[PDB]
């Protein structure tokens, strides 16, 4: 599949038994989600963005299904205005920019 | 070209006669640059991001070269840890996501 950039590139994920919408974000090194409930131990981290830094929990080896592809990676859970899928997962599904 | 996402997708732009590097950012909407000086009248605006909000100058109809493709769009000038090309210009150069 190929997605143009005339509207936000939003896809559907499954993670932790929950379904969410999330933004394909080539401007993000990492994947950040709000209001997902993940099991197990995590570590605290802080991420920066435009306009500031936010405190998050880091979960490793979280299985995630992104547009019907199954991948596994680190998922940050914390206050984000929109769910974001970053490069750490986009590489897993083979996603590229083309022009 | 084709750009994989194993490293940040950074391109070289030319804008207002100056050269800059910028991150191709599919999670943006808008283009924001840090230290350029564009001629003419602007409008003040606030943009939102992950950690908060920033106050910027909106310039319209700014010519810009993005990997040799010549494009005209709105560019926002203000506080940002990295220059960012958003969907507004990326649609002009034909950029898409592929997987």
């Amino acid at each position: 599949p190929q997605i143009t950039l005339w509207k936000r590139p939003i896809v559907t994920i499954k993670i932790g038994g929950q379904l969410k919408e999330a933004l394909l974000n080539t401007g993000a090194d990492d994947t950040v989600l709000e209001e997902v409930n993940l099991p197990g131990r995590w570590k605290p981290k802080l991420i920066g963005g435009i306009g500031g830094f936010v405190k998050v929990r880091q979960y490793d080896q979280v299985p995630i299904e992104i547009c019907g592809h199954k991948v596994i990676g680190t998922v940050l859970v914390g206050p984000t205005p929109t769910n974001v899928i970053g490069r750490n997962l986009m590489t897993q599904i083979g996603c590229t920019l083309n022009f | 070209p084709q750009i994989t996402l194993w490293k940040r997708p950074i391109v070289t732009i030319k804008i207002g006669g100056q050269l800059k590097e910028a991150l191709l950012n599919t999670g943006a909407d808008d283009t924001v640059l840090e230290e350029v000086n564009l001629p003419g009248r602007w409008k003040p605006k606030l943009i939102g991001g992950i950690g908060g909000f920033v106050k910027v100058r909106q310039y319209d109809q700014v010519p810009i070269e993005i990997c040799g493709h010549k494009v005209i769009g709105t560019v926002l000038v203000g506080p940002t840890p990295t220059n960012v090309i958003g969907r507004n210009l990326m649609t002009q150069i034909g950029c898409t996501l592929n997987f």
């Binding site: 936000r8 933004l23 090194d29 990492d30 929109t82 | 950012n25 958003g86």
Partner: peptide, 6 residues
């Protein structure tokens, strides 16, 4: 509108 690094 606009989205992240550690």
């Amino acid at each position: 509108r606009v989205x992240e690094a550690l």
